[PDB]
Design a protein around this ligand. Structure first.
Ligand SMILES: CCCCCCCCCCCCCC(=O)SCCNC(=O)CCNC(=O)[C@H](O)C(C)(C)COP(=O)(O)OP(=O)(O)OC[C@H]1O[C@@H](n2cnc3c(N)ncnc32)[C@H](O)[C@@H]1OP(=O)(O)O
Ligand SMILES: Cc1ncccc1COc1ccc(-c2cccc(C3CCNCC3)c2)cc1
Length: 392
């Protein structure tokens, strides 16, 4: 594998291409509360929905602040389109920098997300224009590769993973149409099936602290090394992406927990999950779904190559994650079939979701990597070791 083309730093245009009449390019400054609000306004009403128009992802302003001003970020990579007259923000596309490992080669990339066009401007071929412009801004800063996900099929996906959903408040999810009541059942039986213990079981389990950063950093990168495609975490990235800062962040977005061994007092495990609401588009009884998403995790047990033992360890840890997520009043716990997740998704009663999330690399060729599933789109322990990066 390797890059597809070499970019000529001399030929990168200093000026952007033209836009549809009445619109103009605009760099967003997300340290400005009004501009953060503008992006949130756009996304809230125009970002990704399900195919039945029942739900729309509802990234919080705190989430956007977190996701988009990560270590190394540049405002030049927060790209907006405005209406010239009204000044209204009508489109966005965003990137942040990170390093990834693609089959043992380290690569500097941008992670691309929050591509969004106002519904009234759809189907006008603006998306290629947005893509080309963020590409140009990246090129100017010496970045020539990207990684991203999408639910739509685009040329040469590097992998695909299925969505999985673990009901925490099943009744909530029933009343919003998220979860069905099967023909043969009752509310009580569904609540029974999804019931969770009142307390966690892993000994030594506690919220991650800043003092844990170095140890979690070491453990995480050793664990992610087990995957063909993975994120090459820096220390500042562990701090930013895993350690909630309550003093300066009003609405918590990231939860992290470590296992401090009772005997050695070393960190032997950790897991984490983030808060991403969905808007319930039209419902009498509810306005939102409060969802938690599984993010990064690691365990020393992985390094024995004893899959039964890894399976056992993950079943306990991930059930603890559910209980903690429930305690934090999340309605549902979501995950993908990446990492070692096929080892626990079905047994801990995650229900299979619809379709796949596809993973893409820009300007980089590599062989497809396994995404946790077989040909039937079902979790498969023999199809792991592939995708070791979670994106937002
Ligand atoms: C070196 C640095 C490189 C950095 C850049 C790397 C590449 C980054 C790539 C971007 C990563 C984004 C990652 C995320 O954020 S994925 C999230 C995408 N956002 C949404 O789903 C929000 C709801 N939808 C919308 O806002 C619009 O429907 C969007 C903007 C998605 C399409 O707007 P619209 O419906 O008005 O379409 P058009 O008439 O302007 O354009 C039609 C063309 O656009 C292609 N299209 C449609 N959907 C996507 C999609 N999700 N990824 C890439 N391409 C897409 C489509 O195949 C067609 O191509 P073609 O027929 O010409 O082949
Ligand atoms: C509840 C909801 N909100 C917005 C759109 C669709 C839906 C439907 O139910 C879903 C519940 C969960 C997911 C989901 C689960 C795990 C990972 C993801 C990725 C997370 C990164 N961005 C792409 C989606 C989505 C997708 C859909």
């Amino acid at each position: 594998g390797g890059p597809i083309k070499i970019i000529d730093p001399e030929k990168v245009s200093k000026e952007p291409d033209a836009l549809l009449e009445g619109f103009e390019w605009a760099t967003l400054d997300l340290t400005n509360e009004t501009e953060l609000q503008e992006l949130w306004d756009l996304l809230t009403y125009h970002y990704v929905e399900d195919d039945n128009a029942m739900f729309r992802f509802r990234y919080s302003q705190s989430f956007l602040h977190w996701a988009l001003m990560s270590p190394g970020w540049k405002k030049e990579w927060h790209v907006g389109v405005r209406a010239t007259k009204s000044r209204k923000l009508v489109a966005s596309i965003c990137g942040v920098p990170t390093e990834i490992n693609v089959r043992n080669q380290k690569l500097k990339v941008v992670e691309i997300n929050f591509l969004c066009i106002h519904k009234k401007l759809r189907s006008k071929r603006l998306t290629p224009v947005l893509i080309k412009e963020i590409t140009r801004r990246c090129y100017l800063n010496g970045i020539y590769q990207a990684i991203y996900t999408a639910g739509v099929v685009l040329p040469t996906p590097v992998s695909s993973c299925r969505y999985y959903h673990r009901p925490l408040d099943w009744l909530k999810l029933y009343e919003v149409g998220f979860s069905p009541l099967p023909a043969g059942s009752t509310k009580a039986r569904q609540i029974t099936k999804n019931h969770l213990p009142s307390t966690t079981s892993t000994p030594g389990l506690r919220p991650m602290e800043p003092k844990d950063i170095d140890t979690v950093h070491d453990l995480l990168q050793r664990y992610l090394s087990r995957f063909a495609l993975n994120q090459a975490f820096t220390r500042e990235e562990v701090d930013h992406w895993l350690v909630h800062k309550p003093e300066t962040v009003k609405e918590q977005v990231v939860w992290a927990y470590v296992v401090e061994d009772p005997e050695t007092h070393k960190i032997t495990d950790f897991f984490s999950f983030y808060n991403l609401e969905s808007t319930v588009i039209q419902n009498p009884k509810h306005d939102n779904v409060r969802a938690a998403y599984l993010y990064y995790y690691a365990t020393e047990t992985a390094f024995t190559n004893n899959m039964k033992a890894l399976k056992e360890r993950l079943l306990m840890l991930m059930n603890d994650a559910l209980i903690l997520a429930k305690k934090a009043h999340f309605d549902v716990f979501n995950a993908l079939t990446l990492h070692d997740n096929p080892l626990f998704l079905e047994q801990l009663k995650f229900g299979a979701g619809d379709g796949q999330l596809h993973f893409y690399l820009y300007n980089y060729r590599t062989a497809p990597v396994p995404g946790g599933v077989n040909e039937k789109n079902l979790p498969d322990e023999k199809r792991m070791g592939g995708v070791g990066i979670v994106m937002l």
